[PDB]
Short mmCIF file of C-alpha atoms and ligand atoms in Angstrom, two decimals:
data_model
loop_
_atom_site.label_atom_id
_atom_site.label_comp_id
_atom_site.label_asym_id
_atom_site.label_seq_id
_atom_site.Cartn_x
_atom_site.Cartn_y
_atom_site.Cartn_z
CA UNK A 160 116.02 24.81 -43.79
CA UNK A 161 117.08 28.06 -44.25
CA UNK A 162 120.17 28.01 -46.99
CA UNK A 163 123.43 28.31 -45.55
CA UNK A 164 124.94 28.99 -49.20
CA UNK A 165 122.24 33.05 -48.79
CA UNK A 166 124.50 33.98 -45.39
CA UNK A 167 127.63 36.08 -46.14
CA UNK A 168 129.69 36.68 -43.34
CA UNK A 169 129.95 40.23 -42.17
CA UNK A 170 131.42 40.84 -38.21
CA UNK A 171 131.45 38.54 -35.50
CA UNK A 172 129.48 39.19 -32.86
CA UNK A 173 128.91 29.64 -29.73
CA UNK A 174 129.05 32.64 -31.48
CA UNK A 175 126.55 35.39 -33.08
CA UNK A 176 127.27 36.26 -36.41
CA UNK A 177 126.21 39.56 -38.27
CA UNK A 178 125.11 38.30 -41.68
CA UNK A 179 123.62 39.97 -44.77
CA UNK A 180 121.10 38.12 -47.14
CA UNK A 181 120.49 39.46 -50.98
CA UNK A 182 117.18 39.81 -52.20
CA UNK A 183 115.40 37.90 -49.01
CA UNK A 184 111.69 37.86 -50.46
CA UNK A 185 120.47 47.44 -49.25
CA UNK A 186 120.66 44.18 -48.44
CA UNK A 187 118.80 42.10 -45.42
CA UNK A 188 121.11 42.06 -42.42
CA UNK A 189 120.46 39.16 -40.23
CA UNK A 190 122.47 37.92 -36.80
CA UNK A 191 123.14 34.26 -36.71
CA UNK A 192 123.56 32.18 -33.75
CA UNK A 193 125.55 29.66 -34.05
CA UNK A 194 126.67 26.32 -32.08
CA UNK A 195 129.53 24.99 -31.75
CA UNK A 196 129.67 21.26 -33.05
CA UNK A 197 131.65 20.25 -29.79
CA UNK A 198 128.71 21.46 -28.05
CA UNK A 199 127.27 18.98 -25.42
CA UNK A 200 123.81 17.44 -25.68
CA UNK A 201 122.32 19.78 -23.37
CA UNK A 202 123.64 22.77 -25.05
CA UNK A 203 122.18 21.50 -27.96
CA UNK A 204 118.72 20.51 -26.64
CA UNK A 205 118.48 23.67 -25.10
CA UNK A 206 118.90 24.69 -28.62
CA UNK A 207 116.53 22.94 -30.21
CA UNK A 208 114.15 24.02 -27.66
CA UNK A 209 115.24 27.85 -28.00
CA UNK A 210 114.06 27.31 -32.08
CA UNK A 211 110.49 25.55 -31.00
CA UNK A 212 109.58 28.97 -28.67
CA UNK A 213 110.80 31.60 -31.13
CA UNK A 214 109.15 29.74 -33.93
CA UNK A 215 106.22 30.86 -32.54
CA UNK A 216 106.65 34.46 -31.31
CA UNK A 217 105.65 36.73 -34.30
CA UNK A 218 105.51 40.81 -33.14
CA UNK A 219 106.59 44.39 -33.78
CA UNK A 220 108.29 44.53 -30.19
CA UNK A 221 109.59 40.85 -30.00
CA UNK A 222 112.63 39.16 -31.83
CA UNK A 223 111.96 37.05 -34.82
CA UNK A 224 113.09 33.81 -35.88
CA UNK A 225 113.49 34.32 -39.40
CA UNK A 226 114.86 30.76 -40.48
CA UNK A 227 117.03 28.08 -39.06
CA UNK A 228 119.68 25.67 -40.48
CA UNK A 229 119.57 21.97 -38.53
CA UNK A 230 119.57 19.11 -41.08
CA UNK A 231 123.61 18.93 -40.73
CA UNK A 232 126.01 20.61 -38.66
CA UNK A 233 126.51 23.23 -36.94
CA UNK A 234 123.10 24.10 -35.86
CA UNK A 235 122.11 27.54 -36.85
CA UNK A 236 119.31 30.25 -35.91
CA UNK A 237 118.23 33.03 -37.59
CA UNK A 238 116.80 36.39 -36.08
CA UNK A 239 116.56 39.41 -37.40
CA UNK A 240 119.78 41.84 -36.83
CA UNK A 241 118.87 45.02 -33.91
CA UNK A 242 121.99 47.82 -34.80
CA UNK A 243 122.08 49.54 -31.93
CA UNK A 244 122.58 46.47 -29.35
CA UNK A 245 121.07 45.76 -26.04
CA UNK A 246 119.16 49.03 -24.12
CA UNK A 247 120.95 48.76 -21.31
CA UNK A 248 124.14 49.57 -23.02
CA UNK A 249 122.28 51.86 -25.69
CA UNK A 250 120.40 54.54 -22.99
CA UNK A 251 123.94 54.46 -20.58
CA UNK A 252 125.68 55.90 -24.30
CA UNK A 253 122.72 58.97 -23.88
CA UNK A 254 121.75 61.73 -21.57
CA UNK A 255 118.44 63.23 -21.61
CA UNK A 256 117.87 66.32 -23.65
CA UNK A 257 118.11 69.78 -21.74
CA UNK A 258 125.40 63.53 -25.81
CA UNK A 259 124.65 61.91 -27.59
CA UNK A 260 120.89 62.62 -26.35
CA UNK A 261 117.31 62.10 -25.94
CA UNK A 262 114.03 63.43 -26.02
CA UNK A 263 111.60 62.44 -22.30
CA UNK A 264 109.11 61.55 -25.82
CA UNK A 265 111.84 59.20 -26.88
CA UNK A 266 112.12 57.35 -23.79
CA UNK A 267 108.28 57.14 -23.31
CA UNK A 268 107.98 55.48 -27.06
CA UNK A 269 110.90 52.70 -25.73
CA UNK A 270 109.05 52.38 -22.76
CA UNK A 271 105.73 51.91 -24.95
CA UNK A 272 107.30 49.75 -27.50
CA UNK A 273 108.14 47.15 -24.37
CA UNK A 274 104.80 47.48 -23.36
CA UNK A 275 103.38 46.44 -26.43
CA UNK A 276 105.88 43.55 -26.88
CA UNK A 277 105.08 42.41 -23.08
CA UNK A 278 100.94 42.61 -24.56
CA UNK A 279 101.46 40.46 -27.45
CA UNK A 280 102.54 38.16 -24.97
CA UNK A 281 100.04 38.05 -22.25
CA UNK A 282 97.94 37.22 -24.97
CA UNK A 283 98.95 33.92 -25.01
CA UNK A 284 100.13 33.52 -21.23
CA UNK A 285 103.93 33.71 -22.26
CA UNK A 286 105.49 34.91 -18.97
CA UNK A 287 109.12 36.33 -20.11
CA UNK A 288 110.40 35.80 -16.25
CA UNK A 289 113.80 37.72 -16.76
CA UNK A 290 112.75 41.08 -18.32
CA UNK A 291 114.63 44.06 -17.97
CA UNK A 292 116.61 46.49 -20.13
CA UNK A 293 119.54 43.80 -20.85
CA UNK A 294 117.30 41.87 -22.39
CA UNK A 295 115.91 44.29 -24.70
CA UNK A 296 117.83 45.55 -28.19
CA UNK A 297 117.58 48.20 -30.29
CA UNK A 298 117.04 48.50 -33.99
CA UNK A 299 116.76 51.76 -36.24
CA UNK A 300 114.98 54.65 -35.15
CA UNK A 301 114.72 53.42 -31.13
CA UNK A 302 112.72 50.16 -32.27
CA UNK A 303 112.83 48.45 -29.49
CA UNK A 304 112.66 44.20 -29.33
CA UNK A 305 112.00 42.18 -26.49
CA UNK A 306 114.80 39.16 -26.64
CA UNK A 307 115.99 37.19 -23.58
CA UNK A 308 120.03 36.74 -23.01
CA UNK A 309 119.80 34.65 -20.27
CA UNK A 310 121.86 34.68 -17.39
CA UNK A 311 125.40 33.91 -17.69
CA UNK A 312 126.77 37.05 -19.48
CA UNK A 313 129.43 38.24 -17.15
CA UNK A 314 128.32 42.19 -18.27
CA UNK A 315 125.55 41.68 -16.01
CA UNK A 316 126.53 38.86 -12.79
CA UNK A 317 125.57 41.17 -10.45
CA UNK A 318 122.08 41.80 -11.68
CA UNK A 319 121.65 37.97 -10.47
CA UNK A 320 121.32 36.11 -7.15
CA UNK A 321 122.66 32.51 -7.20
CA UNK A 322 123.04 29.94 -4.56
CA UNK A 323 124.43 26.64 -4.96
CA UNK A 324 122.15 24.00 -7.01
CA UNK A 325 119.45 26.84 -7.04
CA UNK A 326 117.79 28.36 -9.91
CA UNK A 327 119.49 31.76 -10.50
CA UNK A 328 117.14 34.75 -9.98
CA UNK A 329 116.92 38.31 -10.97
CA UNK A 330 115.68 39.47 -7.58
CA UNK A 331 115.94 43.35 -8.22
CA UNK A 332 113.22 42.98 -10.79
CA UNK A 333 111.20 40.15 -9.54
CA UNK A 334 107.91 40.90 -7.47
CA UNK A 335 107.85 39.74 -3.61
CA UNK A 336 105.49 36.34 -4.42
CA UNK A 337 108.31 35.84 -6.81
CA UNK A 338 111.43 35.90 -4.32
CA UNK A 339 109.57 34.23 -1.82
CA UNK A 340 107.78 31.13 -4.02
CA UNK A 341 109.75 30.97 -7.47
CA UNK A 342 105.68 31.70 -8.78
CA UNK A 343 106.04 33.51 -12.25
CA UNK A 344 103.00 35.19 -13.66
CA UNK A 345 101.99 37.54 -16.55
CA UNK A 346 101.52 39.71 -13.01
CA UNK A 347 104.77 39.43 -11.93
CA UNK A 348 105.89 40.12 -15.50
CA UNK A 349 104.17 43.64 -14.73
CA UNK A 350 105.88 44.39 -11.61
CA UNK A 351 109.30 43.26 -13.69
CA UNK A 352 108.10 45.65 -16.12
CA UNK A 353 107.62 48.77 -13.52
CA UNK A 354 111.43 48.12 -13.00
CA UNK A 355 112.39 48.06 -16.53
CA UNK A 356 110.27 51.36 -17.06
CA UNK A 357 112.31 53.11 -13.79
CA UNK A 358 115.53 51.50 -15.52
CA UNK A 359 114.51 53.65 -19.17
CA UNK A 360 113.72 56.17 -17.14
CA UNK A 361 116.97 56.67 -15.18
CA UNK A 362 118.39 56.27 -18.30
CA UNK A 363 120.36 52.90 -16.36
CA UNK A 364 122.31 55.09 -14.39
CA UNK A 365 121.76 52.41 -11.78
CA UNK A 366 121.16 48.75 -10.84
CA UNK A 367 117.96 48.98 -8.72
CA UNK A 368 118.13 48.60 -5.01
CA UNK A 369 121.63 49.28 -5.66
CA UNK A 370 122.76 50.65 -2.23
CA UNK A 371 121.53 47.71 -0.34
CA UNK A 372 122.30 43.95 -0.45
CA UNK A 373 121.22 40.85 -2.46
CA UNK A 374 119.83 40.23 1.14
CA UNK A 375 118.30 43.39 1.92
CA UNK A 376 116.41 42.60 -1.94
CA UNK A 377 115.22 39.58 -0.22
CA UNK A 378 114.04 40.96 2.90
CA UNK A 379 112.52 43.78 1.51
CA UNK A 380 110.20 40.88 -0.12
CA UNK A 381 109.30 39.49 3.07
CA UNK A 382 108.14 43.36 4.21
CA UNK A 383 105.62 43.33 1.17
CA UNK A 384 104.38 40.30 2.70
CA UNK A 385 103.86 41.34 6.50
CA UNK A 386 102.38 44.08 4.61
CA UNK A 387 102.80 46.70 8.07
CA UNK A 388 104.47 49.55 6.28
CA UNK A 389 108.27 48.88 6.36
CA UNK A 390 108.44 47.85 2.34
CA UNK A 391 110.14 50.20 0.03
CA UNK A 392 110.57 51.61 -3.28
CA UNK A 393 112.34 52.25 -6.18
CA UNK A 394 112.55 56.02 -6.05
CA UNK A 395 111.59 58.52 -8.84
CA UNK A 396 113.97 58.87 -11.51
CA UNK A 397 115.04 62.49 -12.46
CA UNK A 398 113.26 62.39 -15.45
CA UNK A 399 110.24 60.88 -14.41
CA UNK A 400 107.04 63.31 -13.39
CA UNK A 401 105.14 62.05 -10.43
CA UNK A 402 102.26 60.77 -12.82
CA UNK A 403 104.47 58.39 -14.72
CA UNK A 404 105.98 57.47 -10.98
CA UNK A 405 102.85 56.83 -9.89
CA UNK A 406 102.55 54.41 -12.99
CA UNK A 407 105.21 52.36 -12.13
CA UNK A 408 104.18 52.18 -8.44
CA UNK A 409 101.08 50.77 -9.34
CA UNK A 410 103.17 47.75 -10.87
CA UNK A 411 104.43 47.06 -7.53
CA UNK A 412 101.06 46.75 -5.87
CA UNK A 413 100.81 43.83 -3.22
CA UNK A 414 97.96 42.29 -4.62
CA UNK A 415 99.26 40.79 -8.47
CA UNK A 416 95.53 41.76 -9.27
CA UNK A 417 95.56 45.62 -8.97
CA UNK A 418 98.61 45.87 -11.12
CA UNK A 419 98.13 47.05 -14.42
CA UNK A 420 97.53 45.06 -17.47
CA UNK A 421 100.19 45.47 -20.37
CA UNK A 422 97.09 46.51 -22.64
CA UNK A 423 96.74 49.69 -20.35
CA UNK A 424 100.54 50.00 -19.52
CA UNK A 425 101.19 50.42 -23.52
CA UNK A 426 97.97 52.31 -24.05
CA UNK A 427 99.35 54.63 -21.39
CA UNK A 428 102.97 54.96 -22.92
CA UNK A 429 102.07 55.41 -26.39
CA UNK A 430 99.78 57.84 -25.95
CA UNK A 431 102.47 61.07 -25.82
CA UNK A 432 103.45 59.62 -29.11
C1 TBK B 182 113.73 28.97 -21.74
S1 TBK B 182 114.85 29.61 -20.56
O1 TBK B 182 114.18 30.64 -19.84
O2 TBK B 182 115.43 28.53 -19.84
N1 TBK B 182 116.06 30.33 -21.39
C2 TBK B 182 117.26 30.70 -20.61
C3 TBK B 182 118.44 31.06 -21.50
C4 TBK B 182 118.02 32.09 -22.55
C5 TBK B 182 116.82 31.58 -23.33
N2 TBK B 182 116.37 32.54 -24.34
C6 TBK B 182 115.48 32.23 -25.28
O3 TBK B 182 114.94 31.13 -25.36
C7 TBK B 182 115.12 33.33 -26.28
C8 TBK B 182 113.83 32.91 -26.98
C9 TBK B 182 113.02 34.12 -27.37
C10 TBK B 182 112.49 34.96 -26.21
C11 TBK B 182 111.93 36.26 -26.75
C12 TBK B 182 111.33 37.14 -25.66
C13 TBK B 182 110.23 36.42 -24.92
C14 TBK B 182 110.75 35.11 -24.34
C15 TBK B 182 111.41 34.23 -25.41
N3 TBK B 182 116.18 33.63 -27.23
C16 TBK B 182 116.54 34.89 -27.49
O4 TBK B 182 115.98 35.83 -26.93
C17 TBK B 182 117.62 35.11 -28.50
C18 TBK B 182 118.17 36.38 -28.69
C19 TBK B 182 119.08 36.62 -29.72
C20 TBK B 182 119.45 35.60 -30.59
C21 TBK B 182 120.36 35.88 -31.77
N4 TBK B 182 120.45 37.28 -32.17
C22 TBK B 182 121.33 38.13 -31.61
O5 TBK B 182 122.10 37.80 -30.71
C23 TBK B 182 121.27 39.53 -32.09
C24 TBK B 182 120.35 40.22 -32.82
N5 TBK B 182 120.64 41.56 -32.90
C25 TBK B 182 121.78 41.71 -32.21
C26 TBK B 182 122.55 42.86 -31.92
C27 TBK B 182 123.68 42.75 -31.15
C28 TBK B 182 124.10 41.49 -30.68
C29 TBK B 182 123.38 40.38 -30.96
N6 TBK B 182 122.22 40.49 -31.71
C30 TBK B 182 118.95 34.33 -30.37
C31 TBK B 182 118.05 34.08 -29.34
C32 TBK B 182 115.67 31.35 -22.38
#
């Protein structure tokens, strides 16, 4: 266990506490997940199963489990603290340069940081399943960490298709075999990505698809499918040039097998850095 005695509250934030640690080896900042001791014993497996799959995941781009705190009650987790919170929320506070503001570089070295995050894991055939913006957060200096939220924060409902005794789904960002066969690859983590790299790029100024239905989402997935012409597409952001469009339309090829691999999405990002 990590030492309850080293966490000194700072801000709230089951509850997420911002913590600071002295002399971990200015001060370590840390956020702190905690849960409630009412909790029920699914909240609490789900837990203990949230610790096993962070306790592996060690990258630049990814969140960090730093420590934990189970032996007694409450049960705590440890990640490192990103000051800037989620993307989503960060990019909508910005316009691009001609504010606050930034640079088309800026957003490109997000978009890359992603990239690289989504790499580490392809190489050991972690699909994500739920990425997008909202489940990114951002450190100093645009760091950028993959995390997932879930999907039960009310900030984002919309961005999620439920039906009764269903598994929810993301549908906006989820390729067609995805909508039509619940089939999650590191492929359809690629087409997820092309949407969160049109989301950075329209600096989320809007949901995608957002002018037609949950059910128009769906149907549009069946059109990729009978494959005779009447699918569509995201369009081109504002600030996107029609090379980096024609980046992100690659992601949303039919065939999961001509999409393009993380290691060339993030070699192809980073490189204006
Ligand atoms: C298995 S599932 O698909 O059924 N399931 C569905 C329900 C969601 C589950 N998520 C998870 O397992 C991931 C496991 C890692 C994930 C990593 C990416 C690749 C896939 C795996 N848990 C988290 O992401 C997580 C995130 C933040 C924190 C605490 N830190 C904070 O909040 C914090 C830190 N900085 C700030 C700034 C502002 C506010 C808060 N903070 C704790 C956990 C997955």
């Amino acid at each position: 266990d990590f030492p309850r005695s080293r966490l000194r509250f700072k801000e709230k934030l089951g509850e997420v506490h911002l913590c600071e640690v002295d002399s971990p080896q200015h001060p370590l900042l840390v956020a702190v997940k905690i849960l409630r001791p009412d909790a029920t014993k699914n909240a609490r497996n789900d837990f203990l199963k949230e610790v096993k799959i962070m306790s592996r995941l060690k990258d630049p781009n990814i969140i960090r489990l730093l420590g934990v705190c189970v032996q007694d009650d409450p049960l705590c987790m440890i990640t490192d603290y990103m000051e800037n919170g989620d993307l989503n929320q960060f990019l909508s506070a910005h316009q691009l340069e001609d504010g606050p503001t930034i640079s088309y570089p800026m957003l490109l070295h997000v978009a890359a940081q992603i990239a690289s995050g989504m790499r580490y894991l392809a190489t050991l055939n972690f699909v994500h399943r739920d990425l997008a913006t909202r489940n990114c957060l951002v450190g100093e200096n645009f760091t950028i960490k993959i995390a997932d939220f879930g999907m039960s924060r009310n900030l984002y409902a919309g961005d999620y298709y439920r039906v009764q005794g269903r598994a929810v789904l993301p549908i906006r960002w989820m390729a067609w075999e995805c909508i039509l066969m619940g089939k999650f690859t590191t492929a359809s983590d690629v087409w997820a990505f092309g949407v969160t790299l049109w989301e950075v790029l329209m600096l989320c100024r809007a949901q995608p698809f957002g002018q037609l239905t949950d059910e128009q989402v769906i149907e549009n997935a069946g059109e990729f499918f009978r494959d005779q012409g009447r699918q569509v597409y995201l369009s081109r952001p504002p600030a996107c040039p029609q090379g980096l469009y024609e980046l992100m339309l690659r992601c949303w090829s039919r065939e999961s097998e001509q999409r393009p691999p993380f290691s060339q999405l993030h070699r192809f990002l980073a490189e204006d850095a």
